[PDB]
Amino acid sequence: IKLGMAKITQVDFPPREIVTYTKETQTPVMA
Amino acid sequence: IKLGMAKITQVDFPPREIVTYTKETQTPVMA
Amino acid sequence: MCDRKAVIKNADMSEEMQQDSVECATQALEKYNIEKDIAAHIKKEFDKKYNPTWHCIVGRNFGSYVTHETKHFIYFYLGQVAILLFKSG
Amino acid sequence: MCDRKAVIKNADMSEEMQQDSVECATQALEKYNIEKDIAAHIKKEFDKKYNPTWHCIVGRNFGSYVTHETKHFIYFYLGQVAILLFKSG
Amino acid sequence: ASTSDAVTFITYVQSLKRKIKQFEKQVELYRNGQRLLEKQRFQFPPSWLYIDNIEGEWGAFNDIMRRKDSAIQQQVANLQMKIVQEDRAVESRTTDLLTDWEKTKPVTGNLRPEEALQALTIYEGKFGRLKDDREKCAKAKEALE
Amino acid sequence: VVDEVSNIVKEAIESAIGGNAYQHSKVNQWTTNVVEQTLSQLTKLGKPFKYIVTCVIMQKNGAGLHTASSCFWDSSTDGSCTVRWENKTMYCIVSAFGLSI
Amino acid sequence: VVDEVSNIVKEAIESAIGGNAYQHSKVNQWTTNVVEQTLSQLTKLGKPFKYIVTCVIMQKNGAGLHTASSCFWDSSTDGSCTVRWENKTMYCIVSAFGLSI
């Protein structure tokens, strides 16, 4: 069977990453 | 040609194990 | 009055989420006379509102440094308790 | 230095992760007395040995309810400061 | 994954971190100043945070910027690979377009000067855009690791 | 027909899963049911095609799936039908195929 | 051959994806390269069959996976091969179904 040229239908589902939005603030003890 | 019901490769992926609950904790108290 | 409020020091969250977290912490602290029981009530409120599982760290002395996700993070003081609660997932 | 003896009265976490975190906490307490730095080091060690993400908090007068994953919420106190490495997820 | 945009963001993040070194040095000096104020009782009014409150907000912003820089450093290799592939494909397409326009400029009888000039300019723009895109992707990868 | 194959796949998904979520003990069963429904839809048409129906179900846990179906089939006689149907917490990218017999 | 097809699919998955750092813009390219390599290996085999290849590539993020294909052919002269391959934190599964013309 002489099959013709065929491509591939690409459908990549999306992932979700991790947000490294660190809230930096030094925490002191009671004074 | 002839065709009918048959079998296939049965592959399934079990998921990871984790436990989530509202468990209360506390730090020790000193003076 | 036991006010678990905050000022603009480090508060990176949705406004409704931060207000709900502060109100839930204050209500749990008012309802429960123990710190652990107040933590349990606040965690129940968090798992009911923002779904399971969410935790809040609040106390006189504390410290937090983790992957604080956007619109669900906090690092401040709520009254005598240091409100450092960040939700990621 | 500092008596960084982690006595886990309640250890609902992995033994290997808890031991690695305890060793890192002892090293960090020998390095410095900053409880926030010790908690950050414990959280970083737990997140490195058990993937993202892990959160650890060290304080004196605080009450928090751990909303974490199974076998990853280690509450080991080096004395009285309960360094609860409740890896949320 | 888009190499040009990723490299531009990486170079911008590198410049931002170079400035943020001095910005955070000033932030540490200001945290010390706010602490000294609170020692003199000059903690900031509770409408916003104190001097340490502005310091905590700046620390949150710096944590976000450091997270962006860490993501850039993690994905720099993939961004560079995507940019190199896109630049090579665009340059091959620009070569094909330049050759095709030079071979078959629109040289018909009426308005054929404008049509042939447009075809030649389209081929030249394709080649130059491919070259510029490749150069920009490489420069952004260099500026963003 | 690719449009008919996609419509049959969508109807089978609506009839079997529809708004059903993802369960570990039932994902493979749902995939088998969807594949069987697609195979029955392809066989009942009477077209002389060696129909192949593939069903893959993923969980919406931050995982993306790249779905494709390329086969050594004739361009003017055969083809493949790989589509994706999305749910709230059940990702299902399923493919139907047909080769001239 | 089922074993030969599984070995070729494993070699293609190793050559395409491997166990390197994950990338959404590169996972689809790896899946496409694996599909092209599998198609080339099937075409160079020379056996009288019309293979149908479905490559399922996923990332390890707690999502369940069930890559299955229900078809309509003859098991005496046609068959399919299943190979379990993956990465350090990603999956590389190809479902190849060789069908006699």
Numbering used by the authors:
A (entry chain h), B (entry chain g): 110 to 140
C (entry chain d), D (entry chain i): 1 to 89
E (entry chain e): 1161 to 1305
F (entry chain v), G (entry chain k): 13 to 113
From the paper:
Cytoplasmic dynein-1 is a conserved, minus-end-directed microtubule motor critical for cell division and long-range intracellular transport in eukaryotic cells. Dynein, a member of the AAA + (ATPase associated with various cellular activities) family, forms a 1.4 MDa dimer composed of two copies each of heavy (HC), intermediate (IC), light intermediate (LIC), and three (TCTEX, LC8, and ROBL) light chains (LC), with the IC, LIC, and LC known as accessory chains. Cellular and structural studies have shown that dynein primarily exists in a pseudo-twofold symmetric, autoinhibited Phi state incompatible with movement along microtubules. LIS1 plays essential roles in the activation of dynein, including relieving autoinhibition and helping assemble the fully active DDA transport complexes.
Separately, we obtained a 6.2 Å reconstruction of the tail portion of Pre-Chi. At the current resolution, we could not observe any differences between the tails of Phi and Pre-Chi. An interesting feature we observed in Pre-Chi was the asymmetric binding of LIS1 to the dynein tail. Our Pre-Chi structure suggested that LIS1 binds preferentially to the side of Phi where the bulk of the accessory chains of the dynein tail are found. To see if we could find a population of Pre-Chi with LIS1 bound to the other face, we revisited the tail processing for Pre-Chi and Phi. We subclassified the Pre-Chi particles and viewed all the volumes. As a point of reference, we looked for density in the volumes that correspond to the IC-LC tower of accessory chains, a feature that is only observable on one face of Phi dynein. Whenever density for the IC-LC tower is present in our Pre-Chi volumes, it is located on the same face as LIS1. We did not observe any volumes with LIS1 bound to the other face. We hypothesize that the asymmetric nature of the Phi tail induces preferential breathing of the side where the bulk of the accessory chains are found, which in turn leads to the binding of LIS1 to that face.
